[PDB]
Amino acid sequence: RGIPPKIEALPSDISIDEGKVLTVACAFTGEPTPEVTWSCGGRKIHSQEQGRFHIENTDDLTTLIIMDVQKQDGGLYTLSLGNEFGSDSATVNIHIRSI
């Protein structure tokens, strides 16, 4: 039963045009089910941050949704997982196109 968390695959780089909706989904494993943390700039992303960010988690999938994407939403995002038996982390670099 003591199995550390594992982030399955996550794109390294993704792009979205300003003003559109971005969705990035990522599967994971772990026993017990891990706590999920998304962050950018060393700051946790919260539900309805700026009235636009959302995080929908299930027991094996985490989905980050950014509505009405704005130029300041860019950067290197980290997904981290933790449980009693270990941790995992991976990054996706989110690029906002002004075009």
Partner: protein
């Protein structure tokens, strides 16, 4: 501008013996129906005699006729329509017979 792309079914990893068929599979929704692509290393893949991308309505697939070790790695399913984009990655692991 309609409804942005999302995953009804998410592409799970595939662990496959060298020489076996492998397929990554998902079901993408959105309005208009999203154009889907599969990329590897940030490059859009091209159909060939060993790699195909069967599409049927919301179902999109990445099908390898006979997996080889060099097929291992992370693949990205990128869905786009007018309202937005959705991204899901999945890993192919190829095992020795």
């Amino acid at each position: 501008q309609g409804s942005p792309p999302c995953f009804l079914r998410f592409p799970r990893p595939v662990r496959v013996v060298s020489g076996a068929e492998a397929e990554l599979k998902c079901v993408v929704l959105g309005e208009p129906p999203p154009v889907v692509v599969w990329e590897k290393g940030g490059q859009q893949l091209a159909a060939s005699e060993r790699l195909s991308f069967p599409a049927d309505g919301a179902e999109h697939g990445l099908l390898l006729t006979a997996a080889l070790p060099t097929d291992a790695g992370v693949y990205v399913c990128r869905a786009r329509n007018a309202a937005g984009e959705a991204y899901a990655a999945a890993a192919v692991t190829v095992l020795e017979p």
